[PDB]
């Protein structure tokens, strides 16, 4: 896309506000354990590594329809919505201030219930087209067939424990692409901005912040934000805050929702 | 509110100083264990998760009266107090330098008493109206009926383990809204600034700072601070610094007070 | 104070250090720079620390050159913790790692670091984890004469000024944020049981003491007040007995002459 | 090189994009355990310290051919201005169902990949210059004759002995454990590295497509690509996979690079 | 109680010079020909504080060197003289990647099946650049420490309780490599007007080392008045210590491990009063 000047005047700016609920594995809001995974299980061997249905976190994603940019398609320029900035927050951080749930507990069954703790994984992306994904896994043989709604490659190969550029996808479905085997494709995504962090280990303290005062600038080094193809804005995320440890030591992922407030402006482009 | 010019000269500025004491669960300054929760207990099962009275932390909040501005509410323009900045500190951090309290001890009963340690949760908000809340919980079935002075929703539903926008509130009462199930609503709070952090885990070192040299600017991206509706200033916080571990392993939340020094200025608005 | 112009021409520096006040504060006695052995209350009602087991603030007043009126204004300070390298020591008579074959435990655990520079005594607020704490094992301490449950929170009826070195316990006195208009203070706490100390030292960092209006602390009666505490952890003896360990703090304070209205 | 002015006008900029797969020890993409090491073994004594073939991470490196500049007093070189680089597949570490040791008496999660992290990258106009330095001068590398190591051993190599140097000229061959960047050379390369050690330490990782690293030095001059060759090198260890019985393997991840270059005039 | 006249820079050709050097670590076994070089001898532990006598070679010392700079003044009676002024330093810890090694003969994880313990625990990193020897203050965790197993160490000739705090009667200058123990000597903050020093300590038992290395960072040595260390008698003084943890042997015996540090120092000619 050859980017030209900003469009000025009335109705040249718009905002989009949304939230995305977490997709930890139990993704039905009408059922118990919503916002958690099913109980984690562990393979006996790498050739019998078959996660149960619902124990696998996936990306959250939505396409938002922007205000229509009505115009003649036969002229030498067109208009696109350009995402300038986003204010985004993890919602419900305070819910982790809870140590009376039915959990394993400290100090000879007299202390606190274990809080949700351990692995944290936080990412978000805002773009003008679906987030482009690269397949990469810790175990090429993982069998995802317990849940046919998970979108994964139809063939397995040893090389997918590294980067094999023949294994790619686009994030086009909520609650379906496992984070364990799909990551952003850094060779593409020119029209998306993504930001991610991982803090691993076993029982690691979650470290989280929340504020309504932080603006993330989405403009690139040339001053250009994501350009929304077909007036579609794509928002994606995952926010794992740790594991809930049940009385018997069984564990489930816990995720939290994410909020977004995105500012967009009209940008002229060559046609 | 349509914001017009600043009012200048003498009497155009005022400052508000206050502190808020912690609301950990034992919230009566005339009783033992003030500034701590009652002993934490642990649910036998998720459908029998009923915290005892006084074991759960709540938000601290106050509405402060500001000097009356408008004798005549039918003038074409009116004046409002605009909060410009705040200096805020957690008070009594040094009280955590104490390892001789009646606590569990290190090294086969020869070493130090355990200091207050573990989960930290710190947040404050300054606004021109009550802080707007969103309900979100780790357990939709939590039963708050041991303490009818708490403010919680009248109905429970599975979806409240994620973000359900039908479950909202406003922080209108000190020591009554549980931290564990209410968080700031990021879709509202246009007239409040809030800042929060959480560090979890079991016995995690508290990491705390105190200084009288830091000013937090409350002006938004347009140079406008919170506007105090009805000449009321709203201040809210929570500061959990960890758990006290009793000799038998029984644990209590410990909180600390927070100090605020808020600078406000007169702003003309259209009426 | 009604502040007017700076005097040009007019600057001086003050250099000092403060030794640590961990509990055994006599420089000629064994265990100097450490507390006495920590003891643990049988119950909150019986909580009476032994003499010398609790850290206190270090403080001094420096007499400045005698001078509308002219006052000394503290502009900046270079401050650093002394002797950090002394913590590189794992052969002391301590508990040790790996089945009595590995290193002695280094000094580790709780860290608490604060300093203040002002033109008058640091103003303190009382706040304690246990209102019942009995300080009568050491009558050289300065604590309130009466006890009340409300002191586990902020009760503004319980205040003092930091006028005596090695006497105000850090466990029950903190900087009063509602006062101290003429002092700058800075503090940090890292807790837990055996936490690694994380410390830095350099002679290259200047801390500006000027407030948001460009005015530093103004030295009333030509007195400059410096206060601090630097707890770097616990020494763990062979049998598990523990003692606080503290280190000295150095200060180099730049002052200038300020005219004020009288 | 006598550095003169930047070349102006159209065609004066180019970009190079690539990725490098990790070299943890099993470096064959057709075989199981690709992107991990072979099982770690432990010496019985310092004079019997002979790592098995494939248990040793090595540097990843490539030389990239740039567009030819000079068909014939001054000449033109490509100058590397900046790089955007990221570790790929961080999300693959959100996996606790692999065949691993477990938490909480075989009821809890499988251990994630955790422990030692080592991350470095280098971009230069010639091979990365290396200094030998090892924890054990007696390490015997003879189980794998494809590893590039010095021809003799000496006690002094547990510190810095400047008689023990090399250049990073082969992918998957120079062990990380005994070769580091030579800080006395590398005038024409920029390198950045970090190490977080310990036993089971949480990995702390970030990934974004928004960060540009400037490669210009204090005089405004980036790496100058001798013979129209760009050199890229890295290593990204993200921890260990802990097998059911306690057996452990290094895990590494690939790294992506997008490098911006410009034409710079220099003297013949 | 409480309590060189610098003129202009010399401009033009030959007014700048650079000094490049490295210092090898002094952990206790400081003989580059012997096994255990770059490590201490095995750590031992006192039975009591009055019997705290470290073995020879178990304690780390400062590395240091004086570098001879080009001689500037053929006539020392001139009304002004020239001195080398240290403007900046690029410094790096060398060999960080050597810590990516878990097959050495060490204690190991997971019931003798897992990795050998990497070098881990206490980290101590400091460097100093100045125009005269680093000025030292004695301060110790134990005033009674007996250093007589190694008479090549430089320590005070008498002991006193007060040395567990700051006793300013116990000072020294860092004039010998591999001889001043870091456990009892630190920079004297009341002096060192003509040296810049930077240090950090991360303690604990088995703490992860957190280390960085790059050739892209310049540390400015100029003070607040724009003046760097001035090299008295044309000598540049460089000092450091870089402890990266302990190696844990099979039986639990432990040794300090240190790494070398590299320096590239830029200096310029400065005129001074005489
Ligand atoms: C649900 C259950 O009963 N699990 C027991 C398990 O049964 C095996 C299969 O279950 C899973 C699982 O635990 O859910 C299936 C997962 O996909 C596997 N996970 C991965 C990553 O590959 C895991 C995993 O392999 C094991 O947990 C590791 O030991 O196993 C289960 O679906 C299967 O059921 C058979 C059924 O028995 C048969 O009659 C019918 O015709 O076909 C079904 C489908 O094949 O049986 C599998 C065993 O043959 O077996 C293990 C021991 O092997 C445990 O008994 C496990 O019970 C739980 O174990 C927990 C700890 O892991 C904990 O102790 C819980 O309290 C147990 O309920
Ligand atoms: C695979 C095995 O059974 N190893 C046992 C080992 O055998 C020695 C050689 O194995 C290695 C290895 O484990 O792979 C080779 C490595 O280069 C060594 N690593 C380092 C850093 O030096 C390791 C290491 O020394 C040990 O693991 C430490 O215990 O050993 C093995 O290749 C060699 O094979 C001989 C063969 O036996 C002989 O008939 C033939 O003619 O020559 C072959 C090649 O020389 O035999 C070596 C011993 O002579 O021996 C040790 C005892 O020294 C153990 O028994 C080891 O078993 C593992 O032990 C682990 C704990 O140490 C753990 O329990 C594993 O599960 C065991 O397999
Ligand atoms: C009041 C009483 O007899 N308590 C004993 C307790 O009985 C439990 C249960 O009591 C409670 C309690 O008040 O301690 C009720 C609480 O709702 C519940 N907490 C939560 C978060 O659900 C706690 C908690 O489960 C336990 O204290 C464990 O931490 O229990 C009472 O209502 C029920 O009828 O009987 C229960 C025992 O079967 O039991 C504990 C031992 O677990 C003690 O003996 C209490 O004194
Ligand atoms: C050489 C020897 O006899 N070693 C045995 C030791 O005897 C000790 C003591 O020896 C030393 C030693 O060299 O290891 C002397 C050191 O000054 C001292 N270290 C410190 C910091 O004071 C160490 C240390 O106390 C121990 O090694 C424990 O780590 O001991 C020797 O001089 C004296 O006559 O007897 C002492 C105890 O009987 O004892 C250890 C067991 O603790 C071993 O048996 C050594 O082989
Ligand atoms: C904080 C506190 O109350 N300490 C008290 C201790 C401890 O209870 C025990 O020593 C267990 O450490 O008991 C004393 O007899 C003592 O040892 O001097 C009295 C002292 O007042």
Numbering used by the authors:
A (entry chain E), B (entry chain A): 33 to 303
C (entry chain B): 33 to 41, 44 to 101, 109 to 303
D (entry chain D): 33 to 104, 108 to 303
E (entry chain C): 24 to 26, 33 to 303
What does the paper say about this structure?
Trichodysplasia spinulosa-associated Polyomavirus (TSPyV) was isolated from a patient suffering from trichodysplasia spinulosa, a skin disease that can appear in severely immunocompromised patients. TSPyV has a 5232-nucleotide dsDNA genome encapsulated in its non-enveloped icosahedral capsid made up of the proteins VP1, VP2 and VP3. As is typical for polyomaviruses, the TSPyV VP1 monomer adopts the iconic jelly-roll fold with a conserved core comprising two β-sheets that are formed by strands B, I, D, G and C, H, E, F, respectively. We demonstrate here that the skin-tropic TSPyV binds sialylated glycans in a binding site formed by the BC2-loop on top of the VP1 protein that is not utilized by any other structurally characterized member of the polyomavirus family.
To establish a platform for understanding the specificity of the interaction with sialic acid, we solved crystal structures of TSPyV VP1 alone and in complex with three different sialylated compounds, the branched α2,3-linked GM1 pentasaccharide and the linear glycans α2,3- and α2,6-sialyllactose (3’SL and 6’SL, respectively). TSPyV VP1 pentamers were co-crystallized in the presence of either 10 mM GM1 glycan or 10 mM 6’SL, while preformed native TSPyV VP1 pentamer crystals were derivatized by soaking them in a 10 mM 3’SL solution for complex formation. The highest occupancy was obtained for GM1 in all five binding sites of the VP1 pentamer in the asymmetric unit, and so additional glycan residues besides Neu5Ac could be built unambiguously into well-defined electron density. Nevertheless, three of the five binding sites were not considered for further structural analysis because the ligand participates in crystal contacts. In the remaining two sites of the VP1 pentamer, the Neu5Ac residue and the GalNAcβ1-3(Neu5Acα2–3)Gal trisaccharide, respectively, are well-defined by electron density and distant from crystal contacts. The N-acetyl group of Neu5Ac inserts into a shallow cavity that is built by the BC2-loop on top of a VP1 monomer, thereby forming hydrogen bonds via its NH-group towards the hydroxyl side chain of threonine 73 and via its oxygen with the backbone amino group of lysine 82. The side chain of the arginine residue 137 from the DE-loop of the counterclockwise (ccw) VP1 monomer interacts with the glycerol chain of Neu5Ac. Residue H132 of the ccw monomer forms the bottom of the shallow binding groove so that the methyl group of Neu5Ac is recognized via hydrophobic interactions by the non-polar part of the ccw H132 side and by BC2-loop residues A75 and P83. The average B-factor of the Neu5Ac ring of GM1 is in the same range as those of the neighboring protein residues, indicating that the occupancy is near 1.0 for the ligand. We found that TSPyV VP1 interacts with the GM1 glycan in solution.
